Amino acid sequence: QNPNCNIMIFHPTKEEFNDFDKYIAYMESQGAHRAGLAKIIPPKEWKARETYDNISEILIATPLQQVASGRAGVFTQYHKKKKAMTVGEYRHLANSKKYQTPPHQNFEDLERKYWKNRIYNSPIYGADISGSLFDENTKQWNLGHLGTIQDLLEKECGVVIEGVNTPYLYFGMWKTTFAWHTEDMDLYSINYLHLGEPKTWYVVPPEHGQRLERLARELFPGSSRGCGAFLRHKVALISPTVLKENGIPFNRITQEAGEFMVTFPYGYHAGFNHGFNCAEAINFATPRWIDYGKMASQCSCGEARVTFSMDAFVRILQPERYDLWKRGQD
């Protein structure tokens, strides 16, 4: 199923939107995970929140300026902290002459402009904000309350890691960027675009993830000095042209406001925002993730320090393999 690893798009009914884990399993039964990314369009009647009329006063404590260096589709990006500003102030800044989406004729044109001009006018991203815009009354696909087996991390081990098992908000503007990465511990992620302009995603099928890692070693000198998990640093930007020239299989898709994207374990992804927007995202897990969690690379230089023990997950959800697993641990 899904032999070509196409990004699949799902349209669950209201009845199918009641049980998150069940629907994820269904998607995988149709081969969705092979692409590394899927889109879920919610039932017509569903809404995340009644209104967004009163979000302009939210304070973005630490907006980040995203400074890219490089050329010809290959860049490194680093972040500079900027002064706090409200979402209202941020929206005004996003829409200002310096930062507004350039005039363009179509997606392909905007995409070319993104890659060609990435070093100019470093954009400001209101990223990694602890919080949620889902109404408490929204009981289906509420990112604050998905009820997956990832809940063991807090329940069993008392571990809370912001953004992993608590939700993040992202206020974006044109050119704001997520670099190539898998999730910490190779978890799934889910991302809901609440409002505003689109978000474009690139994804390499998990089966080809190692080829992306090899390419990153070829493109980024010194990337392995002192660390075996460079891409966990989330500093590498690599254009689709460069992926194509180097034979790395990938796909692209644009997420619109009101749509969910799910990334699957070890599905490398990267992308960018088209203009002012607001997304919310969180990690989650399933039983199928456990063996990925066991295998996940870990940064060994202190740059990317999100990690946790797999013990509780194997102990509780893989009881018949727990002794075998422990033997491999020592």
């Binding site: 953004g163 989330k234 999100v306």
Partner: peptide, 10 residues
């Protein structure tokens, strides 16, 4: 304390 991050600093 470790938390999910969009990228790297400095």
């Amino acid at each position: 304390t470790a938390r999910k991050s969009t990228g790297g600093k400095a």
